[model samples]
Target: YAQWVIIIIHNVGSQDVKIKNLKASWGKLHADGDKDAEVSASNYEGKIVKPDEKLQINASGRSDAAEGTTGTFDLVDPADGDKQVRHFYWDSPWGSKTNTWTVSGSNTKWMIEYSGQNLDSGALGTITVDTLKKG
Candidate 1:
């Protein structure tokens, strides 16, 4: 119920912000295979958030799947329409199993956006990504 999150975005160039791929440590059992867990457009949808926004996320693992897995996620530029990537690794220490995701670079002319929804925990959460920075 209580958690502390640390975010490090190297906004290295301009303010062309948007969340990209999530390299998660969730295995392929969800995909029904022997792969390094992948989240397609079906798993989760791409979002557009503003500066006064915070993307609330609560993606949990299932009983049938294995824990401590590594995965990847994808994001695109909300303004320049570029592509980006994020990587994540879920590891448990001490006792509790609490973890999240990370991100990377991008380019112009990204991929297609998922319009509808899939099987992401009924009404998981909402995120408001800041659209305040200017480039």
Candidate 2:
């Protein structure tokens, strides 16, 4: 069965932000489950976002994710491509887990937020969106 997950990527930087790539995966049987699990993604590549605007994404996945799921993405400034903002979520159903990181750039000095909710048989599952740091 397929399910839809909503991922909201908000841009708080001073310049426009472009989504680079997005990936999601889950394990079927512990460590090996991820090897043969079904995965899906949103049409998020090359998507643009202005400051104070939000980039909403719709991703699909399977309910058979027994060993948990993971989602990762990267964002970059339109003017300065070198400055990158990346974040990921792992085992959100297994509870909340967050990490902190920093990026240094002249124009990309805004925090990044990533929050998502997984779908299971028409039910919504727990998700976490860890905040990123800018330096």
Q: Which candidate is the best by TM-score?
A: 2
Model 1 lDDT tens row, 2-85: 121112233333344455554444432233231334235343345544444433333333334344333444445666554343
Query: Which residue pairs show backbone clashes in model 2?
Result: 27-33, 27-34, 28-33, 29-33
TM-score of every candidate: 0.37, 0.51
Candidate 2: worst-modelled 10 consecutive residues by lDDT? 27-36
What TM-score does candidate 1 get on C-alpha atoms? Answer: 0.37
lDDT of 2 by residue, 1-135 (tens): 123344555655556767766665542211112423433344566777776676654433444553334455666656666357554443333233332222233334656544434333331233433333354
lDDT value, candidate 2, whole model: 0.46
Query: Which prediction has the highest lDDT against the true structure?
Result: 2
lDDT of 1 at 40: 50
Instruction: Give Cα-based local distance difference scores for all models.
Output: 0.34, 0.46
Q: In model 2, where do residues sit more than 4 Å from their true spots?
A: 1-5, 27-42, 59-61, 64-67, 93-108, 113-135
